[PDB]
Amino acid sequence: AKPVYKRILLKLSGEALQGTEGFGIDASILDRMAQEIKELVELGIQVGVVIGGGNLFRGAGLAKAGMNRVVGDHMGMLATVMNGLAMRDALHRAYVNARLMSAIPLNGVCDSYSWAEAISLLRNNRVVILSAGTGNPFFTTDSAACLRGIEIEANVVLKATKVDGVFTADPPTATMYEQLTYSEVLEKELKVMDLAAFTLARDHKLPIRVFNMNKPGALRRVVMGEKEGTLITE
Amino acid sequence: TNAKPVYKRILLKLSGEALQGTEFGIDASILDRMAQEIKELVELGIQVGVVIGGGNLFRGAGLAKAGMNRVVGDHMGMLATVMNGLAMRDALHRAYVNARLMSAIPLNGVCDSYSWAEAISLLRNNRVVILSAGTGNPFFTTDSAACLRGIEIEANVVLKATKVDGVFTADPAKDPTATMYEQLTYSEVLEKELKVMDLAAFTLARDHKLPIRVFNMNKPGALRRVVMGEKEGTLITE
Amino acid sequence: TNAKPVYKRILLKLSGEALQGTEFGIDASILDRMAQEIKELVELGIQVGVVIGGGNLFRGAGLAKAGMNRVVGDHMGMLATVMNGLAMRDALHRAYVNARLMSAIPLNGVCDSYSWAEAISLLRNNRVVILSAGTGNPFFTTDSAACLRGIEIEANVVLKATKVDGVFTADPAKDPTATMYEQLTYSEVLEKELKVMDLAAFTLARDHKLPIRVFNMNKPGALRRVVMGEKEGTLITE
Amino acid sequence: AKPVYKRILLKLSGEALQGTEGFGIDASILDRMAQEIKELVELGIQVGVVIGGGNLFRGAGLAKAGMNRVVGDHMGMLATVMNGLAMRDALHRAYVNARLMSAIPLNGVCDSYSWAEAISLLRNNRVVILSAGTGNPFFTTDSAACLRGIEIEANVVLKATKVDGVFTADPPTATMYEQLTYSEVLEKELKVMDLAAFTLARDHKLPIRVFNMNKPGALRRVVMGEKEGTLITE
Amino acid sequence: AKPVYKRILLKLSGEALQGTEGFGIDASILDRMAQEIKELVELGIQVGVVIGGGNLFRGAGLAKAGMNRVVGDHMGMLATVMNGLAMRDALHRAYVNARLMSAIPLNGVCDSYSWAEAISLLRNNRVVILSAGTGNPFFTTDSAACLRGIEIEANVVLKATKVDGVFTADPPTATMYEQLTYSEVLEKELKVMDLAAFTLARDHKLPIRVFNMNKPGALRRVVMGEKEGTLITE
Amino acid sequence: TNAKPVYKRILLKLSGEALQGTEFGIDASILDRMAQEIKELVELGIQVGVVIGGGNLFRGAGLAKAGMNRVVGDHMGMLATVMNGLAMRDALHRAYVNARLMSAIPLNGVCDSYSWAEAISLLRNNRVVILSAGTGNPFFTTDSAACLRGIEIEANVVLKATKVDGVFTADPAKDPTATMYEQLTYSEVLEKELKVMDLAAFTLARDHKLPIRVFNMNKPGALRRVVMGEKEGTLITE
Numbered sequence A, D, E: 001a002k003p004v005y006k007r008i009l010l011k012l013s014g015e016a017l018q019g020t021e022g023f024g025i026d027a028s029i030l031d032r033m034a035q036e037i038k039e040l041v042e043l044g045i046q047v048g049v050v051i052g053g054g055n056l057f058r059g060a061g062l063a064k065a066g067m068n069r070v071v072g073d074h075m076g077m078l079a080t081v082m083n084g085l086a087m088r089d090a091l092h093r094a095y096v097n098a099r100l101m102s103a104i105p106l107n108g109v110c111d112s113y114s115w116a117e118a119i120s121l122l123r124n125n126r127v128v129i130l131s132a133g134t135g136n137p138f139f140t141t142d143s144a145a146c147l148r149g150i151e152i153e154a155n156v157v158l159k160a161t162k163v164d165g166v167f168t169a170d171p172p173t174a175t176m177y178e179q180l181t182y183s184e185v186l187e188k189e190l191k192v193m194d195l196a197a198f199t200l201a202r203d204h205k206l207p208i209r210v211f212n213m214n215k216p217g218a219l220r221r222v223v224m225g226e227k228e229g230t231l232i233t234e
Numbered sequence B, C, F: 001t002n003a004k005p006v007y008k009r010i011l012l013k014l015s016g017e018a019l020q021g022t023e024f025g026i027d028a029s030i031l032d033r034m035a036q037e038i039k040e041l042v043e044l045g046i047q048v049g050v051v052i053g054g055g056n057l058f059r060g061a062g063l064a065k066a067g068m069n070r071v072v073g074d075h076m077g078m079l080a081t082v083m084n085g086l087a088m089r090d091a092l093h094r095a096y097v098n099a100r101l102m103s104a105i106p107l108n109g110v111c112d113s114y115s116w117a118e119a120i121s122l123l124r125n126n127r128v129v130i131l132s133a134g135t136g137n138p139f140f141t142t143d144s145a146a147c148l149r150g151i152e153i154e155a156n157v158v159l160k161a162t163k164v165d166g167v168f169t170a171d172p173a174k175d176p177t178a179t180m181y182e183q184l185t186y187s188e189v190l191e192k193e194l195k196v197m198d199l200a201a202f203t204l205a206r207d208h209k210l211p212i213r214v215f216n217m218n219k220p221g222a223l224r225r226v227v228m229g230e231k232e233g234t235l236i237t238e
């Protein structure tokens, strides 16, 4: 029983790093993720990680309050660097080789995203954390996850949510799909990331796997080709 | 009326805490009000350098206790100040106030990299200069950056904006015996072991005779009072 | 005469193709003419942001088919836009037009690194701002950058300068049935599956109600016609 | 029969990468060069590569058309980065470790030229591609080839041209020299790169070898000390 | 007899690199230091080096002459980069893997200080040279030595002076202490670096060892836990 | 009186040696005087670009003989020019002269990164532009940078400021037969094998017809004499 993927693009939503308070970053979750990612690295799986920032700031949210949307999005991107920073540290303290890259240059703190460098790091079994998403306002980290996934030629984009997967509707009667095609998602107007991102993933045939990052072992199951979450291909 | 400001150039240190205003994150309404108060100083001809905190988001020390490497915790803290500096600058722009955001740690694209020469030139041109990422080094606080930058830009005084009317004998929101002084010397702040800033900062401010006035920025118009020379906060001189 | 421009700020997207003008490379005479036309807009008080293409030199997709890694192909394409931006800026300077070249990917020394705050400040100061390297990311086109930057700088409209009078029903130089519309809605450009820009861009322009006018830049004075509100090209609105 | 050089500075003229049309970049040529350079790397030869840009833009040429010479030269230098980019990729797809450096910082795309880094890469058998020449206008990549050659202490500068070597005149009667001294080149006013470059190579005793990059195996022959092209020393 | 420290922060004062003239940099001293540091690296000791600049420029000194103190300090910091440059080279010519980092970004010349990178280099037995001190005016390299020492979690800060150690007064009757506590230093107003630095080292319990860098083998003795110089702890 | 400068834009190359003035390091009083002389040129409407040497601190070649790798020696030399550029800029600021320090090798924070477009814009705005780190490449001297930058900014002339009245037949402080010419052609400087600059530089200046005037900057007012067209130093033209 060997893993089913060689290189993956793990997308961690920012809310996944929140404690009970539903804000900031929660050490315990980060520490557990480091252990789960550690296991994948040992399993020979190359891991690229795109991290969210919504647990701190959402540009759109700041804009409604009156702020210029672009500055709000810059803050949001910065927030992802903060999460990337905390995640990288959790990885290092777990003795996992990891490099934090940023689409927005932040000398000293981490390194600027570099495709060539990124590929070289992955081939050398370094966990590469991609922060600041796409580097542009008006986008989400989901778009960065798909863009970076395509860029590093990941076998799949693993979207870690707080739910088991894709449901017929936000789960009383709602059931969970095990597999879907981009066509069926759109057709039924199912909820799987932002349209710009999904569309991007579709046009490039980047398969997506929606799974629950709170269910311990879920991540491992997904890479081991075991029944877990929903697969989106076609 | 007829009165004129007592300072020509100041280093205003906006504490992160004071940017919270209930519920963490940033309180838009507070930022919007500060932009109006700073706007008034600019119009009054006062050159303003602003060092902003980040404790309303992250404190390295706090993150370290949770297990994180202290240096990475401080880097996050410094980044948090850039986030506040970003929000503050925007509030300034939307209030039609010319402002630049400089960062101790280069984050090119989102804001300027701190530059002393540039900073002086901007201040002389009546641009509000926001200094973020504090000193750029871990193991320090923005209070140290406020004193360092204040000395660097040759500010006439460092105005520490906080949530308390001044320098108390103990945290007023936790100790009912809390009492604040209206005047203190660098010395008295050493014998009375009073809290103003981390000794590292204070000492720097002392050796260079940089006066410090602590006031509450939650008090609308308090900053203006300070600048006009009216009874507000705690003055700390030699 | 008596007429005034209908736009105060525009995002002009100069397609690489239109910079070819026979024989690949860049056609000096075309650049020189564009500088004169843009010069006129600046004098008319119109703030101009320019997103320039690179397909007259390299197209990532094209390089990929030849065997190159798509990402490196797109990086070359983006660099190609910087080359055009460089030539265009120079044409602007030699025409005595204040202009800045910003690049999505920092190439410090040769040109400025794109900065939103800086860009707005330059536009307000009547500086022509040239945006190169498009969005800075592979898998996108400059058309996406034109829409993104247009939204970013709050342009009143995106003017797509091409080699055809407007949005045809098919490539006019290859299909004799080719016909262009004078008006279309984001919707009609979806039902009629008409070609304007990559859906990625268009969609962005739609969600933000950024109007788009496609015109031929090979037509001397066509840009001026657009800006003055005269019949030219294809207008795409909501 | 082992190679005769340990570290070399390979100078590829921009026109060498042009297809039949005599413009842009031709995949096939790049792909073949990657194979030839691959062989040198395996032979233990450390390779530094200075690439031209004249197959895209020549500052002087742009200036005559009316452009400011400095901007024309900046475009020319950028053109070399484009070639460096394509060449590096050809190297990677041929499974050859290679790093593209630039005298003009281009964050993300490639790395900024760094002498220390360059030496370290060469010692680690990484092909180092130097683009943007000297970084200054009013110079040619030939000057960069000599400057970088001296900098990395290359044993020789291999100037790859479309000709077998140095002739008595641009080859009907013209014959090819097998060896020359800097003195004889100047004396007879022979055509071997720009004066600024040649002079630089002379003052530092940087030997030069002019050879035909279109003649398959020529490069290998030159490094194997076999009769090929012209040698310039003294 | 194995060494007593694993990672150290070696602080070289700028005057230690001066020749007889008492100015500039003296090759011979640099060459000897490279040999002594080489030995530590081979002994498995991870070495971080903070270098001074007072052998070239002191901001305070330039200020008295009329210059703006900040610009004077920038020159002073630059001076440390010059020493760092010369020291790194001495290390490379002695075949010691070394990287020069700077708190003030100096593209091409060396690398910008990076904590993560620094730790990674030390773990890989690379001598890391930290120049431009803290990067801020109004500080000394002694403060940088303590700050960087704490940052890289060095076991001790070795302050190399022109004296055997800490004396009761600048050595006729003055005697040398073998061990002191931060409290006794302050209490007796003993001379051990700047207050800002010492205080910093104290608050973090960073032990300090003052020793003579001119006494050949002194450095080795200190790392071998042999009687040498003064220890400052508590 | 009634006289006007003969140059509109010059490239002033301040040799490191001339910054020594007894005892190595920099002589504050010399820097202060130069600031006053340059101040006068700026007021006279003359645009000034300044390329500064570093030999008063480090010479790569010199360091190499001692055993250091030549490239690292040259990097130190270039850094030395940044140190002089820093001191010179400050002397200019304290003399109330608008000045920018640009460096061939980016040292962001302490000074601007050299930028041709920026440089021209600064000169046109009467800012003294100081160019440090010479050409940015090892194996060259600041004399080459002076000629290169001079050509780049289209200076009317390169003024080589040294410690000798002009171009002598041999080092005047070591050879008593030393004699200087008042006029020379690029050719004569080749047949007479006279010393002005490294052939690499000179040749560049020749091919572009960049005139060169060598004068002593230890002579108070000599720079002004040159600019006013009065007998001073050695003129080297075609």
Ligand SMILES: O=c1ccn([C@@H]2O[C@H](COP(=O)(O)O)[C@@H](O)[C@H]2O)c(=O)[nH]1
Pocket: A013, A014, A051, A052, A053, A054, A055, A057, A058, A059, A060, A072, A073, A074, A075, A076, A077, A078, A080, A132, A133, A134, A135, A136, A137, A138, A139, A140, A141, A142, A143, A144
């Ligand atoms: O490429 C990107 C990615 C994210 N964001 C901003 O950063 C936040 C990151 O949070 P999220 O993607 O986790 O929701 C977003 O809300 C948004 O404001 C962008 O502007 N661009």
Ligand SMILES: O=c1ccn([C@@H]2O[C@H](COP(=O)(O)O)[C@@H](O)[C@H]2O)c(=O)[nH]1
Pocket: B015, B016, B017, B052, B053, B054, B055, B056, B058, B059, B060, B061, B073, B074, B075, B076, B077, B078, B079, B080, B081, B133, B134, B135, B136, B137, B138, B139, B140, B141, B142, B143, B144, B145
């Ligand atoms: O020079 C500085 C300034 C701030 N900080 C960090 O960033 C936070 C900024 O918030 P504050 O407590 O200064 O408001 C601090 O808690 C600290 O962790 C530093 O590391 N260095």
Ligand SMILES: O=c1ccn([C@@H]2O[C@H](COP(=O)(O)O)[C@@H](O)[C@H]2O)c(=O)[nH]1
Pocket: C015, C016, C017, C052, C053, C054, C055, C056, C058, C059, C060, C061, C073, C074, C075, C076, C077, C078, C079, C080, C081, C133, C134, C135, C136, C137, C138, C139, C140, C141, C142, C143, C144, C145
């Ligand atoms: O955001 C962008 C913009 C452009 N390009 C690349 O650069 C070329 C720019 O030319 P154009 O086709 O947009 O004119 C494209 O073909 C493409 O390969 C990108 O990778 N990303």
Ligand SMILES: O=c1ccn([C@@H]2O[C@H](COP(=O)(O)O)[C@@H](O)[C@H]2O)c(=O)[nH]1
Pocket: D013, D014, D051, D052, D053, D054, D055, D057, D058, D059, D060, D072, D073, D074, D075, D076, D077, D078, D080, D132, D133, D134, D135, D136, D137, D138, D139, D140, D141, D142, D143, D144
């Ligand atoms: O250091 C250099 C090297 C090249 N170039 C420019 O870039 C082009 C590169 O092409 P070439 O050297 O292959 O002819 C030149 O024509 C020239 O315009 C420079 O300005 N400086």
Ligand SMILES: O=c1ccn([C@@H]2O[C@H](COP(=O)(O)O)[C@@H](O)[C@H]2O)c(=O)[nH]1
Pocket: E013, E014, E051, E052, E053, E054, E055, E057, E058, E059, E060, E072, E073, E074, E075, E076, E077, E078, E080, E132, E133, E134, E135, E136, E137, E138, E139, E140, E141, E142, E143, E144
């Ligand atoms: O963080 C630092 C370290 C040093 N210096 C300056 O650089 C010189 C370095 O020499 P020293 O620390 O060896 O005395 C100091 O004199 C001072 O002017 C600073 O401004 N900040």
Ligand SMILES: O=c1ccn([C@@H]2O[C@H](COP(=O)(O)O)[C@@H](O)[C@H]2O)c(=O)[nH]1
Pocket: F015, F016, F017, F052, F053, F054, F055, F056, F058, F059, F060, F061, F073, F074, F075, F076, F077, F078, F079, F080, F081, F133, F134, F135, F136, F137, F138, F139, F140, F141, F142, F143, F144, F145
């Ligand atoms: O383009 C340049 C300019 C200067 N230098 C170095 O820096 C020193 C600058 O001093 P100078 O002799 O030009 O005054 C030179 O000795 C040399 O080692 C270079 O490497 N390249």
